[PDB]
Amino acid sequence: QKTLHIYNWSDYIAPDTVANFEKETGIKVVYDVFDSNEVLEGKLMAGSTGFDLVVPSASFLERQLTAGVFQPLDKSKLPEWKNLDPELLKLVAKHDPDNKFAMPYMWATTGIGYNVDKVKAVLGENAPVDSWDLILKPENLEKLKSCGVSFLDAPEEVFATVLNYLGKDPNSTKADDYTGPATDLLLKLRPNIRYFHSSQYINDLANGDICVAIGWAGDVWQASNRAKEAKNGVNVSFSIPKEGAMAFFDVFAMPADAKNKDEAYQFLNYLLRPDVVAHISDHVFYANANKAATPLVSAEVRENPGIYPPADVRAKLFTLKVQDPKIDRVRTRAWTKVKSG
Numbered sequence: 242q243k244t245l246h247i248y249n250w251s252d253y254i255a256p257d258t259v260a261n262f263e264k265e266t267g268i269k270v271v272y273d274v275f276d277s278n279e280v281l282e283g284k285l286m287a288g289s290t291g292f293d294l295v296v297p298s299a300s301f302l303e304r305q306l307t308a309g310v311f312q313p314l315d316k317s318k319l320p321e322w323k324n325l326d327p328e329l330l331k332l333v334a335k336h337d338p339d340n341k342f343a344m345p346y347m348w349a350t351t352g353i354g355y356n357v358d359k360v361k362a363v364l365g366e367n368a369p370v371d372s373w374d375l376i377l378k379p380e381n382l383e384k385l386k387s388c389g390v391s392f393l394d395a396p397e398e399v400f401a402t403v404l405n406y407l408g409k410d411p412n413s414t415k416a417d418d419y420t421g422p423a424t425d426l427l428l429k430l431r432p433n434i435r436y437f438h439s440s441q442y443i444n445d446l447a448n449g450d451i452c453v454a455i456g457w458a459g460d461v462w463q464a465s466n467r468a469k470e471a472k473n474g475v476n477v478s479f480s481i482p483k484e485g486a487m488a489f490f491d492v493f494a495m496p497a498d499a500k501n502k503d504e505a506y507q508f509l510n511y512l513l514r515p516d517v518v519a520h521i522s523d524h525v526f527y528a529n530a531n532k533a534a535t536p537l538v539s540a541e542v543r544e545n546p547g548i549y550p551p552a553d554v555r556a557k558l559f560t561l562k563v564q565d566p567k568i569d570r571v572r573t574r575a576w577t578k579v580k581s582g
């Protein structure tokens with residue numbers, strides 16, 4: 242009996258994807274989930290993960306490659322590879338030279354999820370939901386505390402977002418930018434932040450328990466759809482703010498000690514099938530990286546500019562770079578100060 246172990250982000254597959262694969266191939270899939278790049282990276286660096294496939298963000302994979310934790314993908318076993326968007330492959334190749342190790346899966350942005358009615362009640366009809374001012378201006382966050390504020394537990398993304406907002410290089414290599422202005426602003430915001438978490442905010446937005454969050458786009462659209470399906474009167478939306486936002490590219494990769502490689506390739510080729518991955522986008526509200534799949538995606542998802550953004554919006558997006566050891570240390574120490582504030 243063939244088995245296959247997969248570690249993916251939570252809320253990042255359709256409900257029947259695995260069952261359909263199992264029914265087709267006769268392979269038993271053990272599927273587990275995470276909500277943190279740091280948790281995944283720690284597992285990869287500490288020893289065997291026990292998984293045959295894992296799904297880091299590409300900027301984290303860039304760092305992980307130098308430790309040798311992945312094995313290169315045999316493209317001859319990935320004939321549906323051609324379906325992938327060549328322009329996205331080129332962007333991911335900045336992290337994964339010649340696309341040797343990573344298969345792009347989904348991509349989106351780190352923006353603001355919010356309860357439309359609650360934010361307009363607190364900050365008025367002209368609340369600045371088009372701007373990071375909504376949540377990074379202390380005077381606004383002090384008022385939104387009234388209905389609940391969450392930030393991602395994602396230090397590289399939060400600091401890059403703050404640096405961009407402050408007019409710095411999002412990937413600044415100046416240590417004082419982290420210890421000075423970025424820490425200063427985050428510490429002024431901290432008293433108003435209910436929690437730092439990268440998955441509880443979905444249901445809390447959907448249920449009305451928080452009214453604003455730093456969130457990943459498709460997670461927030463899921464929250465919006467859950468409220469609609471519940472017919473609970475909660476109206477959640479998502480904003481890519483005017484100052485720009487971070488884009489991320491999540492990728493499948495194969496640990497170097499994977500046990501069931503043939504099964505892993507069967508699963509990857511299944512995901513390269515346009516109807517399979519379009520079906521996933523339909524349920525998780527994320528743009529997939531498969532150009533052949535785009536016309537098969539539901540119009541509700543494909544025509545949402547907060548999911549498949551147009552060129553003028555993509556032009557304002559930035560990506561993470563890997564930081565050197567000094568900046569990595571300074572950033573991690575600053576994040577510790579912020580969470581316990």
Ligand SMILES: COCCOC[C@@H](C)OC[C@@H](C)N
Nearest residue numbers: 259260263268269270271272
């Ligand atoms: C795993 O392969 C058999 C398919 O069963 C799926 C469900 C019904 O049972 C396993 C649960 C515990 N995830």
Ligand SMILES: COCCOC[C@H](C)N
Nearest residue numbers: 260263264267268269270
């Ligand atoms: C467990 O082996 C793979 C076959 O399972 C089919 C499931 C019941 N959908």
Ligand SMILES: COCCOC[C@H](C)N
Nearest residue numbers: 328329488555556558559
């Ligand atoms: C065609 O989608 C690629 C999206 O890329 C975003 C970059 C930052 N421009």
Ligand SMILES: N=C(N)NCCCCN
Nearest residue numbers: 250251252253298457489
């Ligand atoms: N920022 C990232 N690399 N990934 C976020 C994906 C979240 C899917 N629920």
Ligand SMILES: [Cl-]
Nearest residue numbers: 242243244269
């Ligand atoms: Cl069994």
Ligand SMILES: [Cl-]
Nearest residue numbers: 307308309310
């Ligand atoms: Cl090595």
Ligand SMILES: [Cl-]
Nearest residue numbers: 364365366367
């Ligand atoms: Cl008003």
Ligand SMILES: [Cl-]
Nearest residue numbers: 538539540541
């Ligand atoms: Cl449709």
